[PDB]
Amino acid sequence: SVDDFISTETPIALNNLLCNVGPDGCRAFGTSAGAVIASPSTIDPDYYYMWTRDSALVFKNLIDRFTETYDAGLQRRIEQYITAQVTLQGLSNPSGSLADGSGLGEPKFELTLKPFTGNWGRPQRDGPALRAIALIGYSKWLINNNYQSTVSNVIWPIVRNDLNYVAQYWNQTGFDLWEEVNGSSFFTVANQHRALVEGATLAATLGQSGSAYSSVAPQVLCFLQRFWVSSGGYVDSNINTNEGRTGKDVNSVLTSIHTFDPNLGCDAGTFQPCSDKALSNLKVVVDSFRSIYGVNKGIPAGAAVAIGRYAEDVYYNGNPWYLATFAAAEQLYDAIYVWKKTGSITVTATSLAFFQELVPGVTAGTYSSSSSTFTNIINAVSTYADGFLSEAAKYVPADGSLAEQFDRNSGTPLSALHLTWSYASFLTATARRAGIVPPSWANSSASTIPSTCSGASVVGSYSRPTATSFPPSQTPKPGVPSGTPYTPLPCATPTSVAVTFHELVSTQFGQTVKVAGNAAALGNWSTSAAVALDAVNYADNHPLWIGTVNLEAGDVVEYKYINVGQDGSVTWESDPNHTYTVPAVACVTQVVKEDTWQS
Numbered sequence: 001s002v003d004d005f006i007s008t009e010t011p012i013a014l015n016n017l018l019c020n021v022g023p024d025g026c027r028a029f030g031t032s033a034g035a036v037i038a039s040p041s042t043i044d045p046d047y048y049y050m051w052t053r054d055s056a057l058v059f060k061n062l063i064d065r066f067t068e069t070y071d072a073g074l075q076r077r078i079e080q081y082i083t084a085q086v087t088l089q090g091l092s093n094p095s096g097s098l099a100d101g102s103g104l105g106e107p108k109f110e111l112t113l114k115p116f117t118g119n120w121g122r123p124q125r126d127g128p129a130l131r132a133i134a135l136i137g138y139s140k141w142l143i144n145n146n147y148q149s150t151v152s153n154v155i156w157p158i159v160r161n162d163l164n165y166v167a168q169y170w171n172q173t174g175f176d177l178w179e180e181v182n183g184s185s186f187f188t189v190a191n192q193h194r195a196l197v198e199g200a201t202l203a204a205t206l207g208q209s210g211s212a213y214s215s216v217a218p219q220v221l222c223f224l225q226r227f228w229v230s231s232g233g234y235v236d237s238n239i240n241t242n243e244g245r246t247g248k249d250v251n252s253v254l255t256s257i258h259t260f261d262p263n264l265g266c267d268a269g270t271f272q273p274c275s276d277k278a279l280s281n282l283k284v285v286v287d288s289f290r291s292i293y294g295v296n297k298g299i300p301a302g303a304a305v306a307i308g309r310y311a312e313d314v315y316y317n318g319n320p321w322y323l324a325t326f327a328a329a330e331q332l333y334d335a336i337y338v339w340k341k342t343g344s345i346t347v348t349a350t351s352l353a354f355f356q357e358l359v360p361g362v363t364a365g366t367y368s369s370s371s372s373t374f375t376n377i378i379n380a381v382s383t384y385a386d387g388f389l390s391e392a393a394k395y396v397p398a399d400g401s402l403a404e405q406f407d408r409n410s411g412t413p414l415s416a417l418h419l420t421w422s423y424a425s426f427l428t429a430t431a432r433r434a435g436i437v438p439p440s441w442a443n444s445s446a447s448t449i450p451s452t453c454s455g456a457s458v459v460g461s462y463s464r465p466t467a468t469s470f471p472p473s474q475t476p477k478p479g480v481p482s483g484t485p486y487t488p489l490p491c492a493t494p495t496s497v498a499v500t501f502h503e504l505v506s507t508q509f510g511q512t513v514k515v516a517g518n519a520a521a522l523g524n525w526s527t528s529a530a531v532a533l534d535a536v537n538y539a540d541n542h543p544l545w546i547g548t549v550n551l552e553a554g555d556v557v558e559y560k561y562i563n564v565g566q567d568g569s570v571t572w573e574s575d576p577n578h579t580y581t582v583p584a585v586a587c588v589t590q591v592v593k594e595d596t597w598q599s
């Protein structure tokens with residue numbers, strides 16, 4: 001049963017999610033405190049970086065969990081994530097610097113919390129919005145528990161930079177959440193709108209300046225309306241671009257679930273999950289995958305299918321994604337929640353096709369909780385939503401691991417292993433199924449659309465946050481649900497650890513980088529026995545060499561990189577030797593050591 005899968009997968013998903021959080025997660029061990037790896041995959045693909053988006057989506061989930069039941073272990077991680085942003089905001093990077101806010105649009109960073117210097121689809125203007133939303137989430141908790149001073153001193157300067165960025169740069173093109181399309185993107189705009197609304201509210205509570213945010217927000221909402229295609233009944237996910245796609249993209253479904261607020265009911269203006277526009281869009285998006293994936297062969301209309309990002313996708317050949325398939329279920333669980341709470345379901349001309357696929361012959365109208373129609377709809381939609389979970393479940397391996405994708409024909413996992421966002425997406429979908437909803441972000445007025453739109457923006461001011469520490473033991477006030485600290489799943493302690501040496505060093509044609517060191521596996525300082533690294537991930541402006549050696553757990557190793565020429569001549573990097581103690585920690589079987597050539 002679905003219930004069986006949920007009960008089994010939940011502790012695995014939570015464990016695997018937290019394994020990807022530094023400095024102590026089992027697959028992110030030795031990364032910076034508060035860093036989140038997108039995936040431990042370092043080769044084909046190389047996802048061993050911290051993205052602003054993935055990190056913020058993951059921590060929003062954790063903050064929501066933590067808000068439901070206090071967990072001092074989660075609190076520790078949340079605090080470290082927040083303080084890591086102090087370092088990141090200050091960075092000058094290829095998108096720009098903090099001075100004019102432009103640097104905040106940078107999509108990804110090295111896990112040492114240094115800039116990523118390679119070519120990339122930058123900027124991505126959703127990042128600051130999503131980060132603000134996460135930090136505002138935690139701020140709400142602190143305020144409710146009488147720690148408002150901590151918000152003002154530690155969190156608000158960080159949040160204020162991100163909010164100023166949104167208010168200044170929302171009306172500018174950039175890359176979408178898939179990092180491919182330079183334009184105006186639904187997910188980005190909608191989250192920018194939410195960030196400004198929550199920001200204005202938090203500012204008012206703190207007695208800080210928020211009027212810029214509240215005056216810009218309605219204009220962002222105004223622009224969001226332009227993504228709707230009335231003739232097709234779906235959202236064109238990217239506009240102001242010439243990419244030549246239909247625009248039918250799980251982008252829009254993710255948008256609905258990440259800006260869900262049940263207090264907004266079935267508001268179509270903000271694209272709520274039970275809104276007629278969101279329901280119509282869901283059907284159009286799902287339908288775009290029904291006929292194209294081998295895994296969907298033989299599944300009838302009215303039944304759940306595996307879905308991907310967008311039908312035109314050619315990334316790894318274009319496949320279903322776990323997070324996309326879970327997102328469809330989540331939107332439906334969100335819809336069911338609101339229908340049950342309000343005791344009423346409205347079918348309109350816009351959502352009719354969606355409903356008739358599930359309840360043949362139903363017509364437009366309003367059906368109350370006493371009607372047989374209400375019960376019929378609830379059951380049909382619940383079954384369909386569970387169907388998306390069960391479809392994804394067919395392709396989850398016995399160990400419960402979630403990669404990024406599963407093959408469109410065979411269902412075998414592919415691309416990045418242990419994608420942090422895949423685990424978050426399972427956790428959120430299943431929370432909504434159980435009727436666990438996140439804190440509200442809007443009031444009724446946050447849905448009122450202006451008469452005429454303009455690209456109104458405000459030039460902001462940016463300053464480096466300086467506070468990098470939280471007061472100890474910020475426990476909940478009496479009466480708040482409270483529990484014991486999180487403990488990871490148990491494993492054996494390994495005797496051997498795969499150590500991936502990950503070295504940035506600019507080299508010229510015919511040169512090879514090797515690692516030499518005192519351990520037998522490293523060649524006991526012999527240059528002939530040194531371990532050659534690979535240039536598989538090498539680029540001139542991101543000169544990465546990589547390779548993996550098994551070392552004895554607990555061993556203290558000393559090493560240096562060498563550059564070996566065509567002629568066999570050896571160049572040692574400058575002193576001192578690197579000194580590394582190989583971890584001997586239960587569950588830590590592979591680590592990445594991120595080095596830069598010592599000049």
Ligand SMILES: *[C@@H]1O[C@H](CO)[C@@H](O[C@@H]2O[C@H](CO)[C@@H](O)[C@H](O)[C@H]2NC(C)=O)[C@H](O)[C@H]1NC(C)=O
Binds near residue numbers: 184223453455
């Ligand atoms: C900046 O904001 C303006 C105002 O919302 C956007 O202008 C609209 O663009 C859409 C799509 O091209 C048109 O359908 C509307 O007619 C435009 N309205 C006006 C008043 O010009 C503009 O697209 C935004 N640009 C970016 C990059 O965000």
Ligand SMILES: *[C@@H]1O[C@H](CO)[C@@H](O)[C@H](O)[C@H]1NC(C)=O
Binds near residue numbers: 524
């Ligand atoms: C390492 O090599 C040196 C030669 O420089 C030698 O003295 C020593 O015996 C070697 N150690 C091991 C572990 O074999």
Ligand SMILES: *[C@H]1O[C@H](CO)[C@@H](O)[C@H](O)[C@@H]1O
Binds near residue numbers: 466467468469
């Ligand atoms: C963040 O950094 C500051 C110094 O800039 C420390 O005071 C603090 O304890 C934390 O390490």
Ligand SMILES: *[C@H]1O[C@H](CO)[C@@H](O)[C@H](O)[C@@H]1O
Binds near residue numbers: 472
């Ligand atoms: C504050 O107090 C808590 C106990 O509630 C400790 O666990 C913590 O180390 C800090 O001293």
Ligand SMILES: *[C@H]1O[C@H](CO)[C@@H](O)[C@H](O)[C@@H]1O
Binds near residue numbers: 478
């Ligand atoms: C949480 O509990 C701690 C005790 O560890 C108090 O210090 C704090 O005021 C809050 O009630």
Ligand SMILES: *[C@H]1O[C@H](CO)[C@@H](O)[C@H](O)[C@@H]1O
Binds near residue numbers: 072481482483484485
């Ligand atoms: C709430 O209560 C739990 C145990 O009941 C503690 O573990 C937690 O630190 C908080 O005080």
Ligand SMILES: *[C@H]1O[C@H](CO)[C@@H](O)[C@H](O)[C@@H]1O
Binds near residue numbers: 492494585586
């Ligand atoms: C293997 O050994 C380590 C010792 O550091 C333990 O921490 C672990 O629980 C396992 O027994």
Ligand SMILES: *[C@H]1O[C@H](CO)[C@@H](O)[C@H](O)[C@@H]1O
Binds near residue numbers: 558576577578579580
């Ligand atoms: C790493 O650091 C240690 C410090 O004990 C040195 O002994 C070693 O040579 C390397 O620099």
Ligand SMILES: *[C@H]1O[C@H](CO)[C@@H](O)[C@H](O)[C@@H]1O
Binds near residue numbers: 581
């Ligand atoms: C790794 O950690 C061990 C234990 O602290 C040290 O002995 C070694 O020098 C390295 O720092």
Ligand SMILES: *[C@H]1O[C@H](CO)[C@@H](O)[C@H](O)[C@@H]1O
Binds near residue numbers: 027587588589590
């Ligand atoms: C080392 O091995 C463990 C299982 O033994 C994995 O969980 C880990 O990802 C690494 O490959």
